Write an enzyme that holds these catalytic residues in place. Structure first.
Site, PDB file in Angstrom:
ATOM      1  CB  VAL A  27      56.275  72.123 -13.209  1.00 36.32           C
ATOM      2  CG1 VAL A  27      56.285  72.438 -14.715  1.00 36.32           C
ATOM      3  CG2 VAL A  27      56.501  70.624 -12.964  1.00 36.32           C
ATOM      4  N   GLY A  29      52.445  78.886 -10.578  1.00 30.37           N
ATOM      5  CA  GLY A  29      52.758  80.238 -10.113  1.00 30.37           C
ATOM      6  C   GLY A  29      51.789  80.739  -9.054  1.00 30.37           C
ATOM      7  CE1 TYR A  31      43.579  77.616  -9.290  1.00 25.42           C
ATOM      8  CE2 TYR A  31      43.464  79.578 -10.719  1.00 25.42           C
ATOM      9  CZ  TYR A  31      42.833  78.509 -10.072  1.00 25.42           C
ATOM     10  OH  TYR A  31      41.471  78.333 -10.210  1.00 25.42           O
ATOM     11  N   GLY A  32      47.318  77.728  -7.199  1.00 23.84           N
ATOM     12  CA  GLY A  32      47.873  76.560  -6.507  1.00 23.84           C
ATOM     13  C   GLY A  32      49.035  76.013  -7.337  1.00 23.84           C
ATOM     14  CE  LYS A  49      46.176  73.768  -9.609  1.00 26.18           C
ATOM     15  NZ  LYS A  49      44.827  74.074 -10.230  1.00 26.18           N
ATOM     16  CG  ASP A 160      38.881  73.065 -18.443  1.00 29.29           C
ATOM     17  OD1 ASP A 160      38.560  72.243 -19.350  1.00 29.29           O
ATOM     18  OD2 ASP A 160      38.082  73.931 -18.026  1.00 29.29           O
TER      19      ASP A 160
END
Length: 327
Positions: A27, A29, A31-32, A49, A160
């Site tokens: 889906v 970027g 980050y993880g 994730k 979050d």
């Protein structure tokens, strides 16, 4: 019983997932990274994730632990929660990868006025979650519409731009408080009511000038609380404007909505309605049930203050993956 995993290449990484998670499709970027998937056990669509570099440094490792502790704790209809966490490793030694599962999400709240009944229902659910989050002594700090996922029948979760940040949070002010989340809510409510961004500040100083235009410059009870002599000087070095009427700024809004905004968008955090007092405001009379509004179990945040080695954070994390109970 460990499930069977399969291995698969996605987002230029190799993923190893229990077989119950089917056709993973990335889906997004930096980050993880996150894949949407089909959970066969529950029939639902889920966000999986892969934490990237979960234990690369100490800051990294402690970030991972914080994320897991947090999600593991949230057990409430309006807040996002953990459906599953897993790893491929069989021992602690082989432990390197942490995957998290949560509900895949239809629509966050970025977008035209809404009806006063829709706003009521939307804000009520945000408040319902904030009471819960707040009663575990957690402050969200960064509420904004894109942290707000709603689904097909308008059921809302807290997941979050400085447009929705409390001014005590922008100006680093120590006189903060749980009610920073509340300021944010006022900024969203107003946005839903009028259709327009309440303070679309172009930059840091703009932002605050726009906020002071609506609420007025600090009273006298508020100056009494500013410690810096220069800060004091500087605040009253600013253009001395009064408070505007909200009924004039919120033309043709439900006067209860207008009342509520006047209790949320106050400069002094000590005088700002709490989430729980707001659930009791007359504006939500249609939705308020004082037995359907649960607070959380107490939340140990003591780990925040701690300085430890990578392998202690990693070990602590593994303990939390080991012990996970599915809901």
């Amino acid at each position: 019983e460990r499930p069977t995993f399969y291995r698969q290449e996605l987002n230029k990484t190799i993923w190893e997932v229990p077989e119950r998670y089917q056709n993973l499709s990335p889906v997004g970027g930096a980050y993880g990274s996150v894949c949407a998937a089909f959970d066969t056990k529950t029939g639902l669509r889920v966000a999986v994730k892969k934490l990237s570099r979960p234990f690369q440094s100490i800051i990294h490792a402690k970030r991972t632990y914080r994320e897991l502790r947090l999600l593991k704790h949230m057990k409430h209809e309006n807040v996002i929660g953990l459906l599953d966490v897993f790893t491929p490793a069989r021992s602690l030694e082989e432990f390197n990868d942490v995957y998290l599962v949560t509900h895949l999400m239809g629509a966050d709240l970025n977008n035209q006025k809404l009806t006063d009944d829709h706003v009521q229902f939307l804000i009520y659910q945000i408040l319902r979650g904030l009471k819960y989050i707040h009663s575990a002594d957690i402050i969200h700090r960064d509420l904004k519409p894109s942290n707000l996922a709603v689904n097909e029948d308008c059921e809302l979760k807290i997941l979050d731009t400085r447009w929705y940040r409390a001014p005590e949070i922008m100006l680093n002010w120590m006189h903060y408080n749980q009610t920073v989340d509340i300021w944010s809510v006022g900024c969203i409510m107003a946005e839903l009511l009028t259709g327009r961004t309440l303070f679309p500040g172009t930059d840091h100083i703009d932002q605050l000038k726009l906020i002071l235009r609506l609420v007025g410059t600090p009273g006298a009870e508020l100056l009494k609380k500013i410690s810096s002599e220069s800060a004091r000087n500087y605040i009253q070095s600013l253009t001395q404007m009064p408070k505007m009427n909200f009924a004039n700024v919120f033309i043709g809004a439900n006067p209860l909505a207008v009342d509520l905004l006047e209790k949320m968008l106050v400069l002094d955090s000590d005088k700002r309605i709490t989430a729980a007092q707001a659930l009791a405001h007359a504006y939500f009379a249609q939705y308020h049930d004082p037995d359907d509004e649960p607070v959380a179990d107490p939340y140990d945040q003591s780990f925040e203050s701690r300085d430890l080695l990578i392998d202690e954070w990693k070990s602590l994390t593994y303990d939390e993956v080991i012990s996970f109970v599915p809901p």
